[PDB]
Every structure is written in structure tokens, then in C-alpha cells.
Amino acid sequence: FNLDVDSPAEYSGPEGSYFGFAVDFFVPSASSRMFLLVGAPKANTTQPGIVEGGQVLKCDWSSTRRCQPIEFDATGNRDYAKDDPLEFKSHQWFGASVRSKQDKILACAPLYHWRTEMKQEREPVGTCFLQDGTKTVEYAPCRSQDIDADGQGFCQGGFSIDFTKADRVLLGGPGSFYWQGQLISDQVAEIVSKYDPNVYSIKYNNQLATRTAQAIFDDSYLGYSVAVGDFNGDGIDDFVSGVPRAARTLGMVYIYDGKNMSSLYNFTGEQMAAYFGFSVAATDINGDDYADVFIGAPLFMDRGSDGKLQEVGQVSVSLQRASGDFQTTKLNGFEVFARFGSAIAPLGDLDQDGFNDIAIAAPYGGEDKKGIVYIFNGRSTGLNAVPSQILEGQWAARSMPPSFGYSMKGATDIDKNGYPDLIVGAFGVDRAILYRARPVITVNAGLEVYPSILNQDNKTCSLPGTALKVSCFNVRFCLKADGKGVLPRKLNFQVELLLDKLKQKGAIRRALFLYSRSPSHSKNMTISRGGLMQCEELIAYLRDESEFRDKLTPITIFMEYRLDYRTAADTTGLQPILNQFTPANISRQAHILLDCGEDNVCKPKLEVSVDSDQKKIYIGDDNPLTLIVKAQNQGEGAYEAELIVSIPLQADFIGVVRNNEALARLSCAFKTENQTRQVVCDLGNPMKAGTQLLAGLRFSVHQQSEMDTSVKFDLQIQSSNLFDKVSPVVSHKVDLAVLAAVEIRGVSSPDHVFLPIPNWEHKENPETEEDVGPVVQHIYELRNNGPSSFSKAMLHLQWPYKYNNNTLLYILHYDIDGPMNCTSDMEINPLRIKIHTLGCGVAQCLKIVCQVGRLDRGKSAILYVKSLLWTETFMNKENQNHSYSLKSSASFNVIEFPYKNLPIEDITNSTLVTTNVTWG
Amino acid sequence: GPNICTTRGVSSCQQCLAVSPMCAWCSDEALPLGSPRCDLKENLLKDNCAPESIEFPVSEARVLEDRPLSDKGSGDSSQVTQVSPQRIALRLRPDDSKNFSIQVRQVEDYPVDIYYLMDLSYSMKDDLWSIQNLGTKLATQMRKLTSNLRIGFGAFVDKPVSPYMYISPPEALENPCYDMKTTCLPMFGYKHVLTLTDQVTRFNEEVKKQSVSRNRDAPEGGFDAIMQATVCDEKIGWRNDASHLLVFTTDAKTHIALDGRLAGIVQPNDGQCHVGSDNHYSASTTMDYPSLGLMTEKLSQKNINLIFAVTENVVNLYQNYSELIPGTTVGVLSMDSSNVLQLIVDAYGKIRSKVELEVRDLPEELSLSFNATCLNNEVIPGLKSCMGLKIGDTVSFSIEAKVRGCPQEKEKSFTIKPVGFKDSLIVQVTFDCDCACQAQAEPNSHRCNNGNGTFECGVCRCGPGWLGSQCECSEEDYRPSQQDECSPREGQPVCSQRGECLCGQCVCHSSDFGKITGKYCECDDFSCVRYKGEMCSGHGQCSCGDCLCDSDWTGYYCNCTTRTDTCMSSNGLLCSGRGKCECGSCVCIQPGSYGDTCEKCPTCPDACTFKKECVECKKFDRGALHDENTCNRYCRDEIESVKELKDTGKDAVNCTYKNEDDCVVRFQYYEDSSGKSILYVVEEPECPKG
Amino acid sequence: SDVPRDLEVVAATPTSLLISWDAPAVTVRYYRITYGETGGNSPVQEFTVPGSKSTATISGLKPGVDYTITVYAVTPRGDWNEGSKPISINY
Ligand SMILES: *[C@@H]1O[C@H](CO)[C@@H](O[C@@H]2O[C@H](CO)[C@@H](O[C@@H]3O[C@H](CO[C@@H]4O[C@H](CO)[C@@H](O[C@H]5O[C@H](CO)[C@@H](O)[C@H](O)[C@@H]5O)[C@H](O)[C@@H]4O)[C@@H](O)[C@H](O[C@H]4O[C@H](CO)[C@@H](O)[C@H](O)[C@@H]4O)[C@@H]3O)[C@H](O)[C@H]2NC(C)=O)[C@H](O)[C@H]1NC(C)=O
Ligand SMILES: *[C@@H]1O[C@H](CO)[C@@H](O[C@@H]2O[C@H](CO)[C@@H](O[C@@H]3O[C@H](CO)[C@@H](O)[C@H](O)[C@@H]3O)[C@H](O)[C@H]2NC(C)=O)[C@H](O)[C@H]1NC(C)=O
Ligand SMILES: *[C@@H]1O[C@H](CO)[C@@H](O[C@@H]2O[C@H](CO)[C@@H](O)[C@H](O)[C@H]2NC(C)=O)[C@H](O)[C@H]1NC(C)=O
């Protein structure tokens, strides 16, 4: 929110040169001056025979606003033979990737082409030039003896580059190995020490590189983007790369160990063609000193209110935990076709609040599709989901979209103001813009009234114009402000004071200042840096007795303060900004003395009472929880009476009861400011005598623990009176209860087997599954629906194995689904066969007993029993033509719950599954 | 009676209408102060004041034109009109709603132009050969469904630039296939050869004049071709009265948007037509591949049905691409493209099997509800689409339009229309926020004498602090003890203590943290309820303690969606027919069923129990599912009475049941891949012998 | 691996003659057969066979004539990529 959009730094290269396609800061240790690095591919150079080789320009903050091209190659194409070029270098897009660490600058040409020195070819290998001081070396790791598309020839290395904490480059290239992509990492010293200008392919010691994979990974485009961070305890920056076309164009992000190049973690997009991994960035947004992952998907399509797909883009925010796998949240875009996730730029701590911040850019959104950059502040809980500022493109369309925000670089403080600044590239208009962060001031203002209660018969002060004694009070307004970084010593504040803010426009003022004789006053204050809260005074005379007829209603003293711009740094137009979330105005209230008794002081007696209409609250689900509050004041009036509901962490307070006349509404608002959640309800200002008020507040508890027995609510009333200002704190608890609705269901597949079996004969020793009979399938499902879960349960299956010594339903196999084990008292499939009513009562029984694990709401446990009808036992002699109903029963018993030390009860039921065989 | 317009009303003519759709105003030419004021019709009626003085605008659904749905859409007549009504005039008073209807029909013989968009990379050389006579073969097949047919051809390979193109050796540029020891022609981004014509011989002639090229990287961008063939309609010759089918044939993967960055292409695709007189896509080298969103938008605007004809290896990929582009169907393409002629006819059946309404240019101030009548008289609320239709069927939709407040927007207009259809329902919206008497001026003084003033519509709202019909008070002291009629239910505090009473009117004080309004100051903003801690969930406006929800939001807390898309299952039935859809979530009715779409029911009966209901009504013409006349809506399965029922069906189910004639019927259920499922019923069942 | 092996004429017959090659160890996408005469200007003729089929047939030429037949292997990478070593035999 502190970025200055009034007077940024405009940089413009030549037109058509994509000036601004890549940006970075340059902070050499050689000097105190800092420079801007702006890549500009498609830029015509002095290189002989080279058309649009591309440049990298050095722009200075010296305010001359001038850029100078950096000499990297300055030479044309080397030759493999006479009239046979070795390199081509025309339209090589040099400067498409520019990154600098300290005194070293790395720039790359991903469209650089090679002759391969074996056959005559033009292969987009890509090359880079690493410059340190006067010396310049060429780094082209993808240029090697591995040539064709199955090699590194189309790799286009230098497509994305990054440094690490200690002298190591991370270079990606999408075209390696039939466009599987590749990451190559080399020590900076190795690149400089091993350079041989007469050697076109240089072998670097300690080179970390990914290797070719199976052809199913073709066209993944690994190395499309790169970022660095530490995602394990080693301490060295590791490798993060987006793979936008990976996994059937879902998009992937790979994290490789920065030491031995092994894979560490993975990310995958949820939507195809969204280009998940187009942009990647690594920063610590929550201050827990663990690097967090940012992944852009500019073409992601969410659903609008109508439900139709719309392309707004989205960014994946993954917070790293010290234990393991991340916590990932999604941030959707705003405008359609804006490509919200195109560029993700970390920028230091922008507001110097202690938590790092970040900027996400939508280059084609905004007014006239000029481009928008969104600034997101970090917090203790992670990234704030809401932008704190937006940057709008100031440049028109011309041939191609301005693409403002297509490239960004932050995190570096180019002026001494003490706040990191930001570079935004456009390249559509061939421009680059620098936004300087403004300093942040945190200001707190106190207001007090001497005294808070006014007596009209107590007239003391004399009016200036004429001599009359008037009831008066004092108002003191104190002001203190400070901030980090560079900012002036003394600050100019303009403060306004308003008396009786309630009654205004057409109304009675009821209060005015002594000297100015006015309801309002203005003051010019000047304070200095930290501490030293200054104060001033003008005093508040009260109007004539019975000049209003309006007693009771408090006189609200209102102070608001602004900042006259004036003071600023030598930065020529950088003025500070007030803190983002902080009140610019503070109010106090004086009350006229009314019905305070003979002591002339109002001492109330406040009382809170709550009965229990709600008794049981069930664990595992939200549910209506309504408390009826009875707040009564027996005694003299209570100034600014408020009901304070101190809630637990599980509260989730909503609304109030409207539907009853017995309890008449209320004014309640949820708020949490200092270390505590609570609900505040206004009981009237003043809350007069009598005043027995009934009301209700609705809550939905998402509970906690599963070791919790109760939930705690504490209630009391507070007021501004000097004596007996509060009420005794009353506590009401409703107990957690366990209710789990568990059902057992079954089905026979099929429920019918018609006799005789078509094309069936009798084998006396069969192992077929065809000679036994048809497949009868019983499926039993134990499902827990009720809100509470259970930890352990037992399941007993009774199965009709035999009737009169011969088989009824021969079980081949049984399978489980969910947290359950099962055991058969008799060996299942003992013959090793491979692919009226008959229950387990009055028939030979085969028992299957099962132990059930934890079953929550949405989950169940299933037992699949595949059996064969034994045709030989039917159809033969004692069973020839009769109707038999095969019956199997299954019962369940819930034996335990995770909610131990809470009431339990028990759950038990049973269902039976029947298979009827018939003749006719 | 007391009601709402009577008390809590009475501010101004325009301010009284904004209260409720049922309210009215009066300019009675007299001054019986009393309480004629702002009130209901029936109340104000018995109070007299009716020399047209009552101003009670009623919301109108009037149709401006409704042509009858035609029977055959081929030739003669005029204005095929497969949608009706066409133009209606919607006129809405503040916070009101009215409802209308729309009927759409897939009409018999309807003109159909089909444009063939073919991959010409080398693995399609087998395909281009067998396509030679399939132009005239397609003529005879489409002749049965449509008398007026048009065909056209276009080709694509990929962007003719590195890394995709063969850039070297220079010996191989005109012949990108050189090491193959044969000859092909240089690759092209998108090549349009034959514009749509009614001569099918003209098709086969241009084919086999075409030949195959070669590319390097496996993904072949056809999205450049799909985008161009859609928006270049003048060049490729889409009829405007016809059903547009664009068949896309490729055996490999495809390039997607932002892939062109490797080739040095940073310019996003524009939906414009860059195919020139040379019939080539000029922007192919200079412009990136189009995104799925941009393709979806231009595909919808030009009413183009896109068909994906792809090989079995890559068919699952284009299925999922089609799932992100609604209205696009996919089909399995044989390696040699011998299957396209049948695949086209099957695709057209799917395209004309569905009806779904789309909305264009809808003002956000008003929202559209939907109920659907597809199968006989049964209504399906919340659904704007119908499924399982055959050509000639007609379906209905009931739509409700409701606003919040009312704009001065100059009334605009918007469009309701089924997808892929030329015909549409155009709705002209209009808003009357204010009475007719406001045009009569009367700037200030009049009955409220000197000290400025104002008179409007039979009442005077005068001055900063002057209040009454006679302007007086303004906190001069001037103390009326008003008591009665400044608060209802006499004995209660004045103006609810929010605000106060001065001069007899309540001018509400304590205006901060939101505004306090109302004549008794009983109303306000921010007084509404919360759902997760966010008031009205952020999905509705707060007006006097009640939430006015945004479009596609309903409920007291405005946290309930009207969206049925998250209730939609993979088979096309919302909640699988096993439950209702409430606030975007299914609630399963059938016992033992669960899941987001109620798709999981392990304890449900087997398909033998389910699909036997189809064989009853479809074959034996009896049982349930017949008397509902749904016998063929829910049963789309092909059924054939046969002998045998052999073994080799692989994935299949054998089923036996006894009908009401005490005979045993035996049938089978079988399907191929993600394709259709077929029921084989054994003819001559087994019955008790005589 | 990268090359087909030992293509040999199978059926002694007039036109509609048959040939058979053997199992390249690499994964093969397609097979490309090219055939025509010996030494004249030559009418090159070709067709495509899926990688799962090891045999092919030819319509043309004579009951008996001196010809030349070549078989190319197709790499399953990129659009159309062929191996370095095609195999041929005369008859
Ligand atoms: C994040 O996502 C990444 C993206 O997928 C994951 O990376 C992937 O991890 C996979 C798991 O390790 C890995 O699969 C392994 O690949 C290697 C490749 O070596 C091969 O060497 C052979 C000769 O060059 C060739 O393989 C032969 O066998 C294959 C069948 O597997 C045949 O198709 C071939 O024709 C050939 O005859 C290949 O050319 C290849 O170069 C394999 O060695 C591994 O084999 C393992 O499994 C087999 C059984 O399947 C075991 O017998 C054996 O001992 C190994 O355990 C794996 O197949 C992917 O290559 C790799 N992909 C990329 C792009 O990196 C990453 O794991 C994931 N990380 C996390 C933390 O989630
Ligand atoms: C929108 O917000 C409202 C209020 O925040 C939600 O109302 C609550 O809805 C539930 C059902 O989803 C009501 O039922 C309650 O939950 C148990 C669960 O088993 C149910 O069995 C009982 O009938 C119980 O009443 C609940 O009463 C209701 N009100 C509350 C919690 O205060 C509403 O669900 C939300 N809608 C959406 C779509 O989020
Ligand atoms: C760099 O110089 C080259 C010189 O060839 C420019 O390329 C020519 O641009 C003109 C006008 O745009 C065209 O008429 C020519 O056809 C181009 N040359 C060729 C060989 O095609 C190029 O535009 C210049 N680029 C910049 C950024 O200045």
C-alpha cells in the first residue's frame, strides 16, 4: 500500500525492442550506486551480420533516466568453415533472461542457434554470457556433443535463470530430450575458471543436471521458470521449476535438492491448459523462516456466479511446514483474460511490518487492457488474501498489448529510504517503470475529557465576552507518531475537534469551546519521532440550562487528524504514508448528570442471567446453539453499558434472534482486538434503572479436542461509571454429547437364481467355478452417518455354509473396503476352486467376524462376499423341486469411541440378506 | 391497515415505490393530512383519491413478437423460427419480479454445414488416402437427416517456425521430409482449401490435390486452425440459418496457449480473422495459440459445434479438453480415418440430442431463475438444460427476472438463447423507479412560502432543518411533546432511541458505522445476519435488517447457490436421479446412497434389477416405466432380440427374471469403452409347458 | 533394437506377395514400406503399417520380376522420426 504511483521512474528503450521483457536490480560491491538491468531482446546491435540480437541495458537511478547497453558479445557469428557459420545468433532473444547477484550479471539468449559441428543444422541450443567486472565468459551448458532432439539441441537453455545463496546458477531449458525439459546448475567460479574461448563445449566440474526420462514425459517443458529456496534442513537453496505441460498439460512444479539434484517435492495443477507452472517464486510470507512456494496458472478458469467457466487465472500459495508436506491455498484472479498468474515477484518487506510481501501481475487486465499489478501483504497467518494496493499501466496499446507487469523484480532498496522498491516491465510499449516505496508511519492519538460527567448547576468558568459563570469541562487531545526507515524528524499534523458529534446538521450543538465560541475547532500540531506524546487544550463550555430539553444523549467529542504533506526526504517527491489499518479518528463521550441521586454520582448494580433451553451439543457437526441473556440494571443509570460475551475458540457467533417479541432484538457485533475473541452487545447509553432486557444470540460450534467435555461462555456487563461499573461474571456451559447414527445394509447380487442352471452337468471333483454354479454375491456395508465418529466396532456375519451335510453357498473369496479386517472360522475355498427358508439357524453355519477401525461421518466399511451356488446339492434327490430361500445375517456392535471421558451409550443393529432359488 | 407502505413509508413519491413491489402513491388535489400518504391500492381505494391520482405501476412480461415453431426447417416458408417467443418487453418496478416462458425445438430437416479440419502431419497420410470418396459417402448419409448439406475442407500442421519447423539443412526446406528419402511439401500453420459448398464432388476433387507435410515436435497446434475456421466465417462460408459442425481430426497431442513462448511468440491470440486471399493463416508465426477460454467464447458466439475426432491413445486427453469446453463432443477415430463417416453421423445425433440455454449481455442488476419442462409435464426446477432428446421434440423453460432497487440505465437489453442456435429470445428491459407527477416541475416556493421551499407530487419536502408540510421548528427550541404517532404501541420510547423526534418527524442522529434510516428510525443497514462471520456472506445487500441477495444467490443468509453444475454427474443426470439438489450440493434420497452426485451406492440393487425395467416396456410393452410415457426417455440403451447370448462379451452381465406371465426372460448388458451400452434380449423365453 | 532384422520373403506367389521382418527390441510406433523396380526412373510406392504388425502385402508389378523393397522404422517421438538404419532385400 506504500508504493508511490504519483512520481515513478519512467524508462523507455527503442521501439520494437521488447525493452522491459526482463528486469532485475544490480547492486555491485564495487560502488554505492545501484542500477537497473533491463533486458531487451529483438534489439538491433552493432554485431556484424546480426539482426535483432538483443541487448541488456544498464539504467541508473542518478535521475538522468538514461540507459546504456552492456557489452557482452559484441562479435558476430563464428565460422565452422569458410562461408559456413558455426553460430547464427540472429533473432537469438539475448536479454530474455537477466538476473544479477552482487557484482555478477547473467544474461541469456534462449533462441540462439547452433551448427552442431557434426552435420549442418540450426538447433536452438541457447547460450548465456556471465559478466563480472570487465571480464565476460560464455556459459552454454546445453551446447554439447549431445545434439539432436533426443539430446540437448533444442533445449533453449537460459529460458529461465536464477542464482543461489552462494555462487551457483540454476539454468532451465524446456526443449531438452524432445521437450521434456532440463535443469542445469553450475558453480559460478566453475563457469569463470573453466571457460575456454577455443572450446565450444565445456565440461564443468560439479555440474548438477536432470537427465533424460521416458518418452511419456515428452513435451513437458521443464525449466520454463525457475526459483530457489530451502525446503529441507540442509541450508542450501534448492531448485524449483515449473513444468506447464507436464502430466497431460495439467502442469507440474518440481522441487529438486540443491545438493545432489534428487527430487524432493511435487505440485500439480487441478485444471488442464491453465499453464500451471508458468511462473514460480519463493519467499517466506509468514515470517516462520521457512521458504514458501508460489505457483502461477495464468489461464486457470474458475466459475462465476452463473457457474460458467471464465479465465481469470490463479496462483497456488504453498506454505512450508517444518514437519513435511505443505499447506496450499488458492488465490483466484479478478478480470477475465487478465492472466492473473503471469508474473510473481517477491519484494522484501514492503511496509516494514516484519512480514515479507509479494506482487502478482495480470499484464492484460485493467482499464483499456493496459495491465495491473496487485500487491499482497504477508501476515503471521500467511499471505493476506486481499490486495493492499494496485498498480495500473499508464501506456497505450500500439501494435501489441502493453503487457505491463509481464516481468517484475522487487526486494531491493534502490534509494536509502529504508524500504524495498519495485521494477515493472512492459515491453509492449518498450518501457520499464520503477516504483519507490514510501515510508510508513504508525500514529496513535489519545483523547480525554475533564470531567466525563457534566453538572449544569456547577457553572464555574467565566465567558470571555461577558462575565457569566458557565458549566465547563476540559478536552485534551494527545498525538504521537513514529515509523521505521528514512523519514523527517518533526511531522506536521492537522487535527480537527468536533463537539457533540451525534447531534449535527439541523440540531442543537449543546456544547461549544470557551474562546472560539464555536462547536468546532482546528489546530496545527508538530510532534517528533518516537515517544514524546504532545498535547494541547481548549475547553468546552456547556450551554444554558434547559436550552435544549435534550438531556441523556451523550455529547460525543470527536477528534480526527490528517497529515499535511510538506515534509519529505531529499528523494524529490517521496512523502510518507500512514499505517494501513489504523483509525484516523477517535471519539470520547461526556454525559450530563441526570438522576444520579443525592451523591451526584451514578452507581448501578448490573446483573446477568442465562437459562438453558439448549441442553445437548453433539460432536462432529455444526448445530444451532442459542443462549438467552437477561441483563438488568437495578440502580442509577449506567453510562455506555455493554454486554460482553467472552466465547471459546469454537464459537462462530452469528446474528441474533429476531422472531420473538418477548426478547426484543439487540445491537451486537463480533470483534476480536486484543488477544481475545468476544461478542459485544449494547445495552443502551445510558442504560437506565429498571431495564430488564431479554435477548438471544445464535452460535454454531465446530468444537475442538475430542477430549473436551464442555464449552465455556462467560458473561458480564461493563460501563463507564466510576463505582460498581461492572457486573459479576456469570458462566454457562453446555455439555458435548456423542450421537452416532450407524446403519448396516446388505444386498444380494443377484437376489434370484432360477433353476435349473442352463448348460450345467455334474463333475464329482470339480475345480472350475463353472461346474459349481452361478456366482451369488452378498455385499454388507457398515456406515456411520451421525455426527460423532467411533473408534472401534465389531461385525459378525452368519453364513449358510451347508444344509444336511452338503454345501449351500460355497464361498470362494471375500474382500474388504475401508478400515476393517475379517476372519473366517472355517477355511474359505477349501477345494481351491479358482476363476423353505434357510438361515444360519437350523443349518450349518460359517461365521465371519470383523474388527472395524475409525469410521467418521462420510466414510463406511464394506465386506464383499463372492460365493458360488452349489448346484449339486439342489436338484438332486432330497431337493428336486422346491423353493429355498438362502438367508445370511450380519450384526454390528460399536465398542469404543475416541471421545473417552465423555458419555457413550452404545450402538447395535442387524440386517439380513436373502438369495432365493426357485423352480416354478 | 398499518402494513408497511402506510407506516415506515411516506417519504416521497420515488422513495415510496422503492419500498415494496406492492405500494402506491397519491396526489389527491386536496389536503386531508390524515394518512392517505403512501399506501396499498385496496387501502387507498376505500380512502377515495382515485382521479387517476393513484400511481401503481405493474411489471409487464408483454411479448413484442412470437412466431409459431415451424415443422420442417428446410426451404420455402420464411424465418424457420426454432425458438419462440422471440422478443418480449420486460418492464420492472423497483425490487419487483415477473416471469415468462420460452419454447425451443430441434426441427426435423434443418440445414447443416460441416467443415472438415484435418491434421496433415505425416501420421495422417494413411487418413488422407481413405478420405477420398468419403465426401460423397457423407452426402448420402447426411441426406437422410438433412436435405440441404454443405461441406468444406481445411488443413493444419503447426507453426512454421523453430523449434517446431525443420529449419535446416537448406537442402530441406521445400521438402521438410528429407532424411526419409521421399518428398512432402513445406509445413503450414493453417491452410483453408475448400469453402463450404453444396457440391460434394467439389470436395473429393480438392482432396488428393492436398498432400501431407512433416513436423518435428509431437504436439500439433490445431487450435490456431479451430480459432480461424470459427471467426473467418466470411472466408469459410458458414450459413447463418444452418447447424454448424466443425470436425477436428488428429491422432496426436496439441499445442495450448503460452506454448508459443518457446518459438519467441509473446503476443496473445486475438479472436479476429487473419486468413487472407492466399487462404493461409498469416498470424501463425507472429501470434500465440488461443486459450481454452478464448476458443470457448468465439465458438459460442458464432454457434459452432466442435467435434474431436481423435485416436484411442489420445482420446482420453481430448475428452478432458472437451469437459472444459461445453457443447463439444469427442469420438474415437480409427488410425486410417475409415471411421469418420460414421463418427460424424453419431456426433450430430449427440449435438441435436441436447438443449441448453445461454445468456448474453445480462445486466447484473437483475437475476434469472429457471425451471425446466423436458419429459412430458414433469418440471425440473433450477435447470436451464434438457437431455435425452430426439429431433422433432420440443421443450419449455420458465424464467423469472428480479431486480434490486432499479437503475436509470436507459433500459439496455439482453439475450436468452439455446447454444449452437441462430434463433434467440431478446428481452428488452425497462425500469420505472418514479411516478409520473415528477415531470411537472414546481421547483421550490409554492405552498411552503418564503425561506426557499419545495413542492413535489402533492407534498412538500423543504429545507435543511425545516421539516413539515408547513416548514417550521428547525431546533429553535420549539418543543412538541409529540408522544403519540412518533412511536407506535404508545408508551414505548421515542423513535426507538435510535435517532430522536424533532418537530414531529424523526431525524435520526448517531449516523456512523453505517446509516440509520426510516421514519421511526427502525430501519438501517448492517443490521442483517452473518453466516461465517461475514454479513449476508457478502452475497447480498443489507436493507432494513434483511438481505437482498446478489444474482445466483438465495436464502435468508444469501449463502445458498442456484447453481446445479456442481450437482451434475458424469452420466448427465443431476444427482444421478438418486437425490435432490440443494444449494449446489446433492441430498440423496435413495437408501444407502452417498457421494457428491450420489454416484456411490454399493448396497443398491444390481443392473439386472434396474435394466429389466427397460426391457419390459421397450420389448414387452408393459410393466412400470411405461404408463408414465417415459418408456423411451430413461431407456436410451439399444435393445435387440436375439438367439444365443454367447460368451465372448467380456465385460457384460447376464440377467434372469420372471415376468407377470410366469415366464423366464434372459438378457445381457454390455458396452464398448466409454461408448454406448447395448441390451441383448433372448427371444422366445422359457414358459410353463402345456 | 533401433533396427528391424532379417526381412525375408515368405510366400512364393505372383502379386500380393508377402514379406516378414523380426522384432526390433525398441518400441516401434509404425513401419514404412517402400518399393519400386530397380534401375529406371522408378515409380516410388509406399504405405504405412502399425508397429504391432510384422508383415505386409503388395499389389502391383508382375507374377515374377526383379524389384527392390525397403522397410523403415518409425520412432514414437515427435511428429515423424525414423531410425538411422532401414533394411532392404531384392527379388
Ligand atoms: C515428482 O514427479 C516427477 C515426475 O514424474 C517424478 O519423477 C519420476 O519418478 C519416477 C519414479 O522413480 C521415474 O520413473 C523411473 O524412471 C527410471 C528411468 O531410468 C530408465 O533407464 C532405462 C534405460 O535408460 C529405461 O527404462 C527401461 O524400463 C522402462 C520401464 O520402466 C522401459 O519403458 C524402457 O524401454 C527401458 O527398457 C528408461 O529409458 C529410463 O531412462 C527407471 O529406471 C525407474 O525404474 C524403477 O521401476 C522399475 C519397475 O517399474 C524397477 O524395476 C526399477 O528398479 C526402478 O525402481 C522408474 O521407472 C521417472 O523417470 C521420473 N520422471 C522424471 C521426469 O523425473 C518424481 O519421482 C516425483 N517425486 C515425488 C517426491 O513425488
Ligand atoms: C447458510 O447458513 C445457515 C446459518 O449459518 C445454515 O443453516 C444451518 O443449516 C443446517 C443444515 O445444513 C441446519 O441443520 C442443523 O444441523 C444438523 C446437522 O445434522 C441438522 O440435523 C439439524 O436439523 C440442525 O438444525 C441448521 O439448523 C442451520 N442453522 C444454524 C446452524 O444455525 C445453512 O446450512 C447455510 N447454507 C449453506 C448452503 O451453507
Ligand atoms: C532491426 O533492423 C532490421 C533491418 O533488416 C529491421 O528489419 C526490417 O524491418 C523493416 C521495417 O520493419 C522491414 O521492411 C524489413 O523487411 C526488415 N528486414 C528484413 C530482412 O525482413 C528490424 O525491424 C529492426 N528492428 C528494430 C527493433 O529496430
Ligand SMILES: *[C@@H]1O[C@H](CO)[C@@H](O[C@@H]2O[C@H](CO)[C@@H](O)[C@H](O)[C@H]2NC(C)=O)[C@H](O)[C@H]1NC(C)=O
Ligand atoms: C464543577 O466544575 C469544576 C470546574 O470545571 C470542576 O473542577 C474541575 O475538575 C476536573 C477534574 O474532575 C479538573 O480536571 C479541572 O481542572 C477542574 N476545573 C477547575 C478546578 O476549574 C469540578 O470537578 C466540578 N464538580 C464539582 C465541583 O463537584
Ligand SMILES: *[C@@H]1O[C@H](CO)[C@@H](O[C@@H]2O[C@H](CO)[C@@H](O)[C@H](O)[C@H]2NC(C)=O)[C@H](O)[C@H]1NC(C)=O
Ligand atoms: C488390521 O490388521 C493389521 C495387521 O495386523 C493391523 O495393523 C495395522 O497396520 C500395520 C501393519 O500393516 C501395523 O503396524 C499398525 O500398527 C496397524 N495400524 C493401526 C492403525 O491399527 C490393523 O490395525 C488392523 N485393523 C483394524 C481395524 O483392526
Ligand SMILES: *[C@@H]1O[C@H](CO)[C@@H](O[C@@H]2O[C@H](CO)[C@@H](O)[C@H](O)[C@H]2NC(C)=O)[C@H](O)[C@H]1NC(C)=O
Ligand atoms: C419454479 O418452480 C418453483 C416451485 O416451487 C417455484 O417456487 C416458488 O417459491 C415457493 C417457495 O417454495 C414455491 O412453494 C412456489 O411453488 C413458488 N411460488 C409462487 C408460485 O408464488 C418457482 O417460482 C418457479 N420458478 C419459475 C421461474 O417458474
Ligand SMILES: *[C@@H]1O[C@H](CO)[C@@H](O)[C@H](O)[C@H]1NC(C)=O
Ligand atoms: C540426496 O540427498 C541427500 C544428500 O544431500 C541425501 O539425504 C539423499 O540420500 C541423497 N540421495 C541420493 C540418491 O543421492
Ligand SMILES: *[C@@H]1O[C@H](CO)[C@@H](O)[C@H](O)[C@H]1NC(C)=O
Ligand atoms: C473514522 O474512523 C472510522 C473507523 O475507525 C471510519 O469508519 C470512519 O470513516 C472515519 N471517519 C469519520 C467517522 O468521519
Ligand SMILES: *[C@@H]1O[C@H](CO)[C@@H](O)[C@H](O)[C@H]1NC(C)=O
Ligand atoms: C425371498 O423370499 C422371501 C420370502 O418371504 C421374501 O420375503 C424376499 O423378499 C424374497 N427375496 C427376493 C424376492 O429377492
Ligand SMILES: *[C@@H]1O[C@H](CO)[C@@H](O)[C@H](O)[C@H]1NC(C)=O
Ligand atoms: C452328517 O454327517 C455326520 C458326519 O459324521 C454324521 O455323523 C451325521 O449323521 C450326518 N447327518 C445326516 C443327517 O446324514
Ligand SMILES: *[C@@H]1O[C@H](CO)[C@@H](O)[C@H](O)[C@H]1NC(C)=O
Ligand atoms: C435398528 O434399525 C431399525 C431400522 O432398521 C430401527 O427402527 C431401530 O430403532 C434400530 N435399533 C437400534 C437399537 O439402533
Ligand SMILES: *[C@@H]1O[C@H](CO)[C@@H](O)[C@H](O)[C@H]1NC(C)=O
Ligand atoms: C409465473 O408462473 C408461471 C411460471 O411458473 C408463468 O407461466 C405465469 O405466467 C406467471 N404467473 C404470474 C402470476 O406471474
Ligand SMILES: *[C@@H]1O[C@H](CO)[C@@H](O)[C@H](O)[C@H]1NC(C)=O
Ligand atoms: C481425464 O480426466 C479423468 C477425470 O476427469 C481422468 O480419470 C483421466 O485419467 C483423464 N485422462 C487424461 C488423458 O488426462
Ligand SMILES: *[C@@H]1O[C@H](CO)[C@@H](O)[C@H](O)[C@H]1NC(C)=O
Ligand atoms: C452369459 O451366459 C452365456 C450362456 O451360458 C455364457 O455363454 C456367457 O459366458 C455368459 N456371460 C458372462 C459374462 O458370464
Ligand SMILES: [Mn+2]
Ligand atoms: Mn536445501
Ligand SMILES: [Mn+2]
Ligand atoms: Mn514460510
Ligand SMILES: [Mn+2]
Ligand atoms: Mn509486509
Ligand SMILES: [Mn+2]
Ligand atoms: Mn526504497
Ligand SMILES: [Mn+2]
Ligand atoms: Mn448515586
